[PDB]
Ligand code: NA
């Protein structure tokens with residue numbers, strides 16, 4: 001009512017109980033995050049990117065990903081040991097709409113995993129977003145269960161939304177509204 | 184809770200879908216001409232200048248004058264993922280409305296038919312139906328796998344049009360946008376390549 005916009009993603013650490021989320025510095029954190037997933041290429045199964053040939057390739061993907069205005073990534077730490085990353089996508093202030101995505105958690109992280117997500121959930125609603133989305137490949141059982149567990153409501157399935165590694169992807173779309181966050 | 188999809192085979196001969204045509208798309212009663220924002224602009228403006236209710240469920244309009252409308256058109260078509268076309272009777276230059284693609288994602292073969300702006304004389308006529316059919320045909324011939332149609336949930340006529348055209352309802356994105364100082368929930372509809380075949 002005189003709605004203008006939701007707030008900007010944090011440019012300083014988001015401090016939790018078990019976890020700190022550090023704004024991602026692609027060329028700095030990049031090598032650390034690359035090493036987290038090297039060796040286990042099955043990590044890139046339910047995702048549209050990866051694996052990466054080498055650190056250069058990973059840093060390239062990270063730079064180009066974070067260069068988008070609508071995307072902001074954070075590094076998960078306990079210490080400054082990077083344990084995974086995640087962030088916001090389709091971040092549109094004017095509509096108070098945002099998505100929590102790019103969840104890339106090391107086997108060691110996958111209660112700290114849960115807190116990383118909630119910190120961004122909490123932060124998006126405190127910055128006055130109206131809608132937070134969560135999306136996943138329909139083959140991804142764990143992600144879908146995670147969404148329900150956090151309180152996201154299933155809205156529908158975007159059929160044939162993507163081709164991921166030459167296979168079909170249907171995207172499940174879930175959302176929490178600001179009235180839902182309150183309740 | 185929503186389906187768990189099983190493993191499926193690889194898609195044979197998958198490649199990125201093509202770019203939007205840069206030449207006219209010719210049908211039997213209609214042709215879709217690539218929009219030339221500053222040339223076609225004043226004609227299209229006049230078409231809607233009269234009844235501001237046209238814009239009621241859309242995220243733009245009305246336009247205070249021609250220049251505002253040309254400015255909007257130009258900035259909309261400047262986006263690399265949007266292409267618009269002017270609806271003309273076959274082999275005529277008389278603009279009867281416009282429409283096009285947005286959110287083109289060539290790498291995933293996903294596209295959205297939108298910016299459907301039909302004059303009253305065009306609405307609910309055989310040329311309107313052909314205009315939309317020509318963008319579907321064209322998208323699937325270009326290798327798109329999924330064609331969306333989206334509307335404000337309060338836009339009854341657009342939802343019924345989508346269904347009439349054979350898009351399937353997928354769901355509603357609640358509080359997706361703030362449009363003209365009110366909430367918008369968005370209905371999402373789609374037509375898949377295999378549905379188009381049938
Ligand atoms: Na960014």
Ligand code: NA
Nearest residue numbers: 260261262265
């Ligand atoms: Na364009």
